[PDB]
Enzyme design. Structure first.
Site, PDB file in Angstrom:
ATOM      1  N   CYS A  56       0.851  -1.225   0.000  1.00 23.09           N
ATOM      2  CA  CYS A  56       0.000   0.000   0.000  1.00 23.09           C
ATOM      3  C   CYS A  56       0.875   1.258   0.000  1.00 23.09           C
ATOM      4  O   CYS A  56       0.725   2.126  -0.837  1.00 23.09           O
ATOM      5  CB  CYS A  56      -0.827  -0.083   1.287  1.00 23.09           C
TER       6      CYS A  56
ATOM      7  N   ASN B 245       3.868  -0.763   3.946  1.00 24.83           N
ATOM      8  CA  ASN B 245       3.591  -2.076   4.597  1.00 24.83           C
ATOM      9  C   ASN B 245       2.969  -1.862   5.979  1.00 24.83           C
ATOM     10  O   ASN B 245       3.258  -2.578   6.918  1.00 24.83           O
ATOM     11  CB  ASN B 245       4.955  -2.757   4.720  1.00 24.83           C
TER      12      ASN B 245
ATOM     13  N   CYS C  70      -0.375   0.381   6.231  1.00 22.33           N
ATOM     14  CA  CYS C  70      -1.817   0.686   6.002  1.00 22.33           C
ATOM     15  C   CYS C  70      -2.449  -0.387   5.111  1.00 22.33           C
ATOM     16  O   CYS C  70      -2.188  -0.454   3.926  1.00 22.33           O
ATOM     17  CB  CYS C  70      -1.827   2.042   5.297  1.00 22.33           C
ATOM     18  N   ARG C  71      -3.275  -1.227   5.675  1.00 25.44           N
ATOM     19  CA  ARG C  71      -3.929  -2.303   4.868  1.00 25.44           C
ATOM     20  C   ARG C  71      -2.919  -3.402   4.526  1.00 25.44           C
ATOM     21  O   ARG C  71      -3.259  -4.408   3.935  1.00 25.44           O
ATOM     22  CB  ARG C  71      -4.426  -1.620   3.589  1.00 25.44           C
ATOM     23  N   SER C  72      -1.678  -3.218   4.887  1.00 21.01           N
ATOM     24  CA  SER C  72      -0.650  -4.253   4.575  1.00 21.01           C
ATOM     25  C   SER C  72      -0.642  -5.348   5.648  1.00 21.01           C
ATOM     26  O   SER C  72      -0.710  -6.521   5.334  1.00 21.01           O
ATOM     27  CB  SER C  72       0.679  -3.500   4.570  1.00 21.01           C
TER      28      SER C  72
ATOM     29  N   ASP D 231      -6.746   3.990   5.010  1.00 23.35           N
ATOM     30  CA  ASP D 231      -6.437   4.428   6.403  1.00 23.35           C
ATOM     31  C   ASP D 231      -5.346   5.502   6.389  1.00 23.35           C
ATOM     32  O   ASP D 231      -4.212   5.231   6.052  1.00 23.35           O
ATOM     33  CB  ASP D 231      -5.939   3.167   7.111  1.00 23.35           C
TER      34      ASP D 231
END
Length: 146
Positions: free
Chosen positions: A11, A14, A16-18, A117
């Site tokens: 993203c 590594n 946010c959403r990772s 995010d």
């Protein structure tokens, strides 16, 4: 001939959403591969309070452990089978470095609206996971698994 692969969930660092793909997937199948968090920008590392995302994760359904975001090298292509880039910047950049002969594929994950995010309000913990899984059934199942 159902096998397991490994998607590169990236993203922008590594974080946010990772670190949410490892949990969403770990629970989606139980314990396999197809989960490889990565990032092409060693900017936010050794920091970022991931207690909020990890918290909501265990409060919504996510089993993780540590999110030591790290810079992505060149093995990401020969180290897995699929590469998932959340934001377009990841897919566009990673593609600006990919060689001309490999065995991995690069697919985008959700549009530039779902997983987003930021880093101030908790408007990502819920959305992040929402897409993290809301886009894992129609993807993993159609990416070469189920």
């Amino acid at each position: 001939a159902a096998e397991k692969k490994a998607v590169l969930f990236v993203c922008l660092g590594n974080i946010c959403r990772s670190p949410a793909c490892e949990g969403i997937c770990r629970d989606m199948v139980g314990d396999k591969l197809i989960i490889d968090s990565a990032a092409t920008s060693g900017f936010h590392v050794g920091q970022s309070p991931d207690t909020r995302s990890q918290k909501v994760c265990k409060s919504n359904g996510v089993d993780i452990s540590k999110q030591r975001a790290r810079q992505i090298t060149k093995a990401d292509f020969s180290k897995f089978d699929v590469i998932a880039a959340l934001d377009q910047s990841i897919l566009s950049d990673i593609n600006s470095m990919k060689p001309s002969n490999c065995r991995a594929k690069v697919v985008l994950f959700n549009p530039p609206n779902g997983v987003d995010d930021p880093y101030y309000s908790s408007d990502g913990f819920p959305t992040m996971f929402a897409s993290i899984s809301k886009e894992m059934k129609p993807f993993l199942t159609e990416h070469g698994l189920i």
